[PDB]
Design a protein around this ligand. Structure first.
Ligand code: NA
Length: 129
């Protein structure tokens, strides 16, 4: 599923991501935009052989099981495929664990490079929330 901007902002808010670990909703929408262009079916293969999955491009090195990332963990206790669902519940639940890990949203290199320090409220501007 390709979410609309305000559609994804609403789904994230309903799943409690708005101000989670102090990150306003526009931070999460901005990260999703640059990670996946709001596509739940987004995938990216890393040089190390791990894969990033879903709207927030969560990686198999630590967070999900895909059966093909030697030495990896599954800290979110999910198959990586769950991160590609039209239902963002698994992606949100796992994002909450990631952002709690110590480095906040720096865990998402695209957030640090493209969202951090910008006017992220523009990503929820005009949305009925
Ligand atoms: Na894994």
């Amino acid at each position: 599923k390709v979410f609309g901007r305000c559609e994804l902002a609403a789904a994230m808010k309903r799943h409690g991501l708005d101000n989670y670990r102090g990150y306003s909703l526009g931070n999460w929408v901005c990260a999703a935009k640059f990670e996946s262009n709001f596509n739940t079916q987004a995938t990216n293969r890393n040089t190390d052989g791990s894969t990033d999955y879903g709207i927030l491009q969560i990686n198999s090195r630590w967070w999900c099981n895909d059966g093909r990332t030697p030495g990896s963990r599954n800290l979110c206790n999910i198959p990586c495929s769950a991160l590609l669902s039209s239902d963002i519940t698994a992606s949100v639940n796992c994002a909450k664990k990631i952002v709690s890990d110590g480095n906040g949203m720096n865990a998402w290199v695209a957030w640090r490079n493209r969202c951090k320090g910008t006017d992220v409220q523009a990503w929820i501007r005009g949305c009925r929330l």
